[PDB]
Amino acid sequence: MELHILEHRVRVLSVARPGLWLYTHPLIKLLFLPRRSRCKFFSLTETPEDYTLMVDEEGFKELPPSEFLQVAEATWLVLNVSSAGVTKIARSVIAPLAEHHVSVLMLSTYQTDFILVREQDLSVVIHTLAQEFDIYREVGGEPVPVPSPTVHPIQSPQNRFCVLTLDPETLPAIATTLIDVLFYSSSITFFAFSLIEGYISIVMDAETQKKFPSDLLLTSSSGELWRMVRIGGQPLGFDECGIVAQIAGPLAAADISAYYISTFNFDHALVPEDGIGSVIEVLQRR
Amino acid sequence: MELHILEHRVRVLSVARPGLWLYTHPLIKLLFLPRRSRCKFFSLTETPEDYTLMVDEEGFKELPPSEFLQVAEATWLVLNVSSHSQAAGVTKIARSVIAPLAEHHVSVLMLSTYQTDFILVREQDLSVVIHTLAQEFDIYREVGGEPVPVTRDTQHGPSPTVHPIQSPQNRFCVLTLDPETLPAIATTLIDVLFYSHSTPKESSPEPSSITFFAFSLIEGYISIVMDAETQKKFPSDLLLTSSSGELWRMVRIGGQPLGFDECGIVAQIAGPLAAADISAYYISTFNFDHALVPEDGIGSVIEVLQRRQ
Ligand SMILES: NC(=[NH2+])NCCC[C@H](N)C(=O)O
Numbered sequence: 001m002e003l004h005i006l007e008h009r010v011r012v013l014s015v016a017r018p019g020l021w022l023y024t025h026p027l028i029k030l031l032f033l034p035r036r037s038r039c040k041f042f043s044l045t046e047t048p049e050d051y052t053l054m055v056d057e058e059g060f061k062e063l064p065p066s067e068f069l070q071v072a073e074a075t076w077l078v079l080n081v082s083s084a085g086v087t088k089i090a091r092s093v094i095a096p097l098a099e100h101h102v103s104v105l106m107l108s109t110y111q112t113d114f115i116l117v118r119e120q121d122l123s124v125v126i127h128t129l130a131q132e133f134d135i136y137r138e139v140g141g142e143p144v145p146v147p148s149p150t151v152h153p154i155q156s157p158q159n160r161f162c163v164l165t166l167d168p169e170t171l172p173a174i175a176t177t178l179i180d181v182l183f184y185s186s187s188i189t190f191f192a193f194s195l196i197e198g199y200i201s202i203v204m205d206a207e208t209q210k211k212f213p214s215d216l217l218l219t220s221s222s223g224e225l226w227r228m229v230r231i232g233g234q235p236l237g238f239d240e241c242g243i244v245a246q247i248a249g250p251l252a253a254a255d256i257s258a259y260y261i262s263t264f265n266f267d268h269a270l271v272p273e274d275g276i277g278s279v280i281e282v283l284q285r286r
Numbered sequence: 287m288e289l290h291i292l293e294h295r296v297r298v299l300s301v302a303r304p305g306l307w308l309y310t311h312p313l314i315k316l317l318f319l320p321r322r323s324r325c326k327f328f329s330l331t332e333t334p335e336d337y338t339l340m341v342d343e344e345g346f347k348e349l350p351p352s353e354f355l356q357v358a359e360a361t362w363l364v365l366n367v368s369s370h371s372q373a374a375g376v377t378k379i380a381r382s383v384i385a386p387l388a389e390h391h392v393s394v395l396m397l398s399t400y401q402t403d404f405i406l407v408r409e410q411d412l413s414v415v416i417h418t419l420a421q422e423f424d425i426y427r428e429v430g431g432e433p434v435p436v437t438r439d440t441q442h443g444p445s446p447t448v449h450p451i452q453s454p455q456n457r458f459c460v461l462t463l464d465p466e467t468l469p470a471i472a473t474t475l476i477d478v479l480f481y482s483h484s485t486p487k488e489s490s491p492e493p494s495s496i497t498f499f500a501f502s503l504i505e506g507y508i509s510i511v512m513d514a515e516t517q518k519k520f521p522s523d524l525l526l527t528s529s530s531g532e533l534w535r536m537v538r539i540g541g542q543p544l545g546f547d548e549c550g551i552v553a554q555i556a557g558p559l560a561a562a563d564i565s566a567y568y569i570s571t572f573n574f575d576h577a578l579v580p581e582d583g584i585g586s587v588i589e590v591l592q593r594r595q
Pocket residue numbers: 098102103104105106236237238239240241242243244245262263264265266267
């Protein structure tokens with residue numbers, strides 16, 4: 001098993017909903033126009049609270065400072081396990097990093113699971129994981145060999161979610177709908193779009209999927225729908241460890257698959273829709 | 287022949303290039319989202335100076351005031367002559383519409399599109415317009431999308447002058463599009479309009495290039511005026527031309543910003559072009575006027591227009 005430190009230096013941002021209009025011009029650029037910036041890591045998540053942006057240093061330069069725009073304190077590095085679910089790395093990655101006081105942010109996409117850590121913790125990350133993983137650093141597309149735990153409240157909306165991908169050539173065909181959804185539109189709004197290393201991933205409501213032109217959004221498991229578990233009552237911050245470990249741990253022990261996405265304020269786990277009853281019950285035992 | 291007063295009340299605006307960030311949200315909406323606006327008249331023209339908007343009262347509400355937004359005084363009414371019974375465009379109406387309105391001191395704004403030629407007049411001038419044109423035209427007013435017969439019914443700018451002209455070397459296309467195919471060109475249209483390098487604002491009788499891009503959605507119909515080089519950026523089988531071979535040269539009519547009060551600017555261009563039977567589309571922007579003539583006729587046009595007095 002290999003751990004890869006990817007060639008991305010990511011900043012974590014919050015755009016306040018009343019001030020999204022101001023970032024329309026830079027965000028349209030990052031969403032749709034790859035020749036217009038050197039951005040290679042772009043992730044946008046809409047929640048009721050805010051729009052969460054995970055973006056590299058180059059994409060970060062597109063976004064001017066304002067009262068509507070929060071920036072998390074550190075530069076984040078991106079981790080990836082190779083040879084689509086967080087359950088499989090709960091014991092090997094998530095729990096050991098939580099135990100060694102390394103704070104994470106999660107980004108599950110259609111393609112793979114990204115684990116983000118702060119630049120300051122890389123030495124601790126390597127030390128913790130060098131024994132189990134062959135650790136590689138991505139340079140020029142080539143692999144090169146190298147704050148107190150709390151039980152958090154959980155809730156599940158009735159929304160049914162799809163984890164989707166797209167042929168990068170067909171992105172222009174969904175542009176107007178994606179613009180409409182993002183900038184102009186128990187229930188909780190959740191919309192995630194990411195463009196990472198040319199790969200498109202979209203997390204979407206079943207009702208929102210109806211708005212898109214047919215036969216463009218692709219998935220290997222068509223009709224596989226996911227229920228959301230929202231994690232935290234208060235805003236979670238970026239210092240507290242063991243939050244992902246509280247969720248992925250019991251789910252791995254029950255052998256239930258999960259996507260995991262961290263927003264600026266809250267954590268979000270996606271579980272198979274018919275297994276939601278088992279999931280709530282399993283997590284109730286912490 | 288008939289003259290139709292269309293069912294539109296228009297405001298004329300200028301968004302300065304440095305203020306594009308503030309207006310991207312309202313502009314994208316008006317361009318691509320017909321369900322989210324009651325707007326039935328939207329015209330956007332990119333120049334090096336600005337973005338000129340001609341928009342109805344409903345679309346006008348989407349645009350908040352700022353140091354980057356300039357709005358003309360008047361509410362404008364839209365006139366149209368359907369004439370298909372020889373030279374094309376505003377040349378068809380130079381003698382019948384444009385010259386008489388100038389003589390009776392009615393200031394105009396022109397918007398030639400793929401479909402037809404729109405003549406914009408200030409609301410306060412409608413009585414004079416009808417009186418000037420009733421003898422030649424059967425005048426109708428659009429009410430609920432149906433024609434209704436019209437039987438009822440001081441200068442504050444600079445003196446009329448001969449305005450300096452220049453002809454940029456760009457080759458322009460007048461294009462339409464199936465409205466159902468607008469989503470397919472959206473990203474390219476966005477890229478061209480809002481994210482491209484434009485020609486500097488800072489003389490030449492024939493400059494190499496000027497930035498000029500016109501898009502309009504009026505009563506469901508799309509019109510695009512575009513550089514021939516710019517056309518290559520778009521996907522292949524979507525833009526519709528109706529021309530095989532010959533394109534259009536711009537004559538920019540300028541000097542000082544033309545304002546909205548001086549009359550006889552369109553007349554001093556369209557009048558001689560009619561006398562020389564040259565096809566002309568004519569687009570007014572916030573600051574300047576733009577005549578499009580057949581590219582092979584450009585030498586004749588310049589020669590004709592330099593005999594103005
Ligand atoms: N803003 C957030 N979503 N914070 C929670 C992320 C997970 C937490 N830092 C952990 O290491 O377990």
